[model samples]
Target: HHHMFANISISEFDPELAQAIASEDERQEAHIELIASENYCSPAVMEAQGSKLTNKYAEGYPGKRYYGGCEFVDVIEQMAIDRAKELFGADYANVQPHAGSQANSAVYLALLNPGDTVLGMSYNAVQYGLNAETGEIDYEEVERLALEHKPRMIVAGFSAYSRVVDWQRFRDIADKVGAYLFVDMAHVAGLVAAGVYPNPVQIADVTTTTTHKTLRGPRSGLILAKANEEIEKKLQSAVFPGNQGGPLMHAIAAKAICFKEAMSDDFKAYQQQVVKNAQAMAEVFIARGYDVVSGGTDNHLFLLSLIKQDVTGKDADAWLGAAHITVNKNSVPNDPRSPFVTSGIRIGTPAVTTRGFGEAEVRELAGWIADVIDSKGDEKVIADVKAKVEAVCAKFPVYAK
Candidate 1:
């Protein structure tokens, strides 16, 4: 078993990889994963991810491949595309792009020309100590910008947004501006899948997501669109011979396995639990006087605005990192700080919830977190919190080894 596990480890010597694996092991043993974008894929999914399919290079669509001996690979890829479309009620699905960013790029390729105007959310990049925020571009302002520039695409969705998105409203705005509404549901795909949130596929001209976040699959990308023959051709071409060469067949197979798993009743239950956990955490944070963005989350993650708490995202991230409670700093709506040292922290329950935690655990974890932050610069309090965090992580156990 150990030998088999060693073979499955993707990176052995890279320090970050090592740290992540060690951290996962620690999480499996003690700490809880509060990061909303993370989850535990099933053994079946892992098996598929590490399967012999990785040896193949069956690029292009199912029937038409760049390589020989791709019969089975084609079947797997087609099944992935089919399952994705059916699950999301999409007219067209491309289970190709290597990552969510790539998926977004592909959508851009399909819909816009170079130098075409695009509108995204606005926030200070480092003000929240999170990478997702780097500028200030309010939605209304973005609309105004779009009006002035006549951008071809109005990009909706956010990496760190913690509020409900009005897809119809965005669609309306896009239509009014004569621009395509692209929803980047990368962070909340699981919520969308479980019906906990509105499905963007029905409204957005194009939707992109990372299969791993919330979707709980191996890291990969998927694209969906409303039924349109021309759009489908554009999507396929962009993903294939346009931007990338051959598809990652192994990842595609893994995504298919994950899609099947996601369609299960068990997965739905898990997703529901994820939302409940997030709500519980948000409530705790609010009670502790942490300002949750948009008041609170309607989905799987929320931003804890630290301005009122008198702490910067940079300090909070450092403090939490020292205690082994990993989370990213994030920008609040209309934040004033730089992107590298933001004023908020983003927390989610998908990963910790996946580890089988419930409302009670969330409440307790919230208390522990509050204790750490409230302790501020007190050395003894910090030490105590660190110990408690280590103990909690030990109780949960994140990896087999």
Candidate 2:
């Protein structure tokens, strides 16, 4: 009874924006979300995000906000900050950045000199560490370069890699070079919280993540810092002044709820299934004549290269989109195609898992995906697959009642 928007018609108030929002919601409802970085938040998280805190402009840290009428916002923001540290074992937390990239950028500004030479910040960062064939990190090669150049910092983490990172080794390399070990654990933050993946928070000087990905909150960023007097000071100032103004108290409320959700055993179980579902999809892809990068995945995503299928990633992406299977085109290592097309597609199961899809359902999803891709956008094939996609999507509600 209390769920209505109080008879306030968004369509009447603003039909254009309202229509777009409705269409987007319909799209979300109809499609299978396979994009690795995307996730479905709980209704509570959504409610908190859409709450009244959006009106507050607490232009500073908790208890020290620049504006008045900050009492409630300070509580909400502080709760998020404390929950962030508790969830990630961080010494200090900043739950402010608008997105993960902003969090990373703030850390970079705090810890590194932008104008000066910095290694491991470019494409070669992964290029140097990657095994061209296996798609695994080559630690010897990583250490060799780090020791040779003695870069001021070592950045470790990837958006597309589907294997567990050895954070301790990165720490060792940083220790050897007398460098700061920074990890952008944006993609794996939930798995790490679930103890399924190794955590870099204790090992790295600074770590950043988005609350929305595996963390399953809202579309917001969080920073978790390890103990260091000077580093802590630099990061706070950099985030507050160098990168952003007042924190989004609404998003922080959502993040606080997300962090609390993440601390639960149910969240851990959900994340474990997320990884399992990805593995299941990868196995199906490999069995059905697709080339999965790294031979297979050890994490919550796999890179499905289209080389073996005589298709371009661009064509496959469009074909699958037509079939209502949502995934993003991605560049495989040594990809021959342009960035616009790429040689591979990156798919994962977090969003589907959030919708209660298990290994069996996801495997069927894989089958339909393979069917659509193998046929290469034949209209009849795509339409049939789209019907099947709709059938499957019908069973799972993205947001529970």
Candidate 3:
């Protein structure tokens, strides 16, 4: 029994959980995923996350851990750190944080005290919104807010913004106010890695991103920074003793593979396609008279405002899901509806691009979405789109058969 336990497949040992996991796979294989923060990792990255390294308990930095049997894990962690630094062009990197929030929290812990002021888009932090009419970042407004507030830190980057963020302007503002510039490039990390999006690793005092969203790796967090010897020590200690313990070696290995995959020409082309697909979808929606926030997109995602339409984002999201297209309801520039039932839907191209979709497939899919929204969830129209979605999903399988 002991020998069998070590090698038994999940389906053999846990049929209940296996059934749910299998059903999820079937759903993903059949449906079109359009979530902005979601993506399908390559098999190599998946393999690294599911490896035996999960059993390790390396509780400190590489080459100097608090536990034994870390010789092998040390090599893995160091590889992750090195690859992350190289990928983002950062002088220092910490791949130990378990999630994006942890990465950000570690940065704050490393630098700030209990009541230090911070300006950024967080749950409780001082916030800034996009320009109402154009649906783009208002740099003048950002400067005004920073000058008036004079916070200890000025946060740049976003989860839902769809244009090029001027990292240089943010850095200048931060310097003028004597505040640290922290950029959370979580949503665009993959694009940045592929050189499709601007890199903020060197400009910001600290940069943080999740490994899963655009990086398409295991769910984990990464922190990157330029050469600041003083802050670097604080970061390492914050991740080790100040925050999480026993680094997730398996996820770190997956992150390493993700960084390596991002360096490939194919990956760069994929990211380019991702932007093209999103732009194509935006064009379709805009042509159909839908109000696309910011007029259009320059990145992997865009916000489709349903404020002028009869259908709400909640209904549109449900209608699309019924048609085998998955997306999340989001708040637009000036939403009339509440957060739970917003007036917009956030759509992205990362998952579809990972499934090998190009502009043609994306254009067709976007038309289907337009049809569904126009029909206001008509049953007949939903049925037709469902069939088409199934066919296209089959044509572009998430993984090879």
Best by lDDT: 3
User: After superposing candidate 1, which stretches have Cα over 4 Å from the reference?
Assistant: 1-24, 123-145, 399-401
- Tens-place lDDT per residue, model 3, 17-133, is 999999999999999999999999989999998899998888888778887888888898999889999899999999999999899999998988877778886322677767887
Per-model CA lDDT versus the true structure: 0.78, 0.86, 0.91
- Provide the global lDDT of candidate 3 against the true structure: 0.91
Clashes of each: 33, 0, 0
Query: Clash pairs of candidate 2?
Result: none
Ten residues in sequence with the least summed lDDT for candidate 2: 118-127
lDDT of candidate 2 vs native? 0.86
Q: lDDT tens digits, residues 1-401, model 2?
A: 56755667788789999999989988998899899999888888988888888888778787777778887788888898899888989998988898887898898889877454344633123335577666878788888888777777788888889988888988888898798888888899889888888889988989989888898889988888789999989989889889998877888899999889999999999989998899999999989999988888888898999987878888989999989998999988888889898989999889999988999999998998899888877999999989988987888878654
Q: Model 2 off-target regions past 4 Å?
A: 1-9, 121-127
Comparing 1 with 2 on lDDT, the higher-scoring candidate is 2
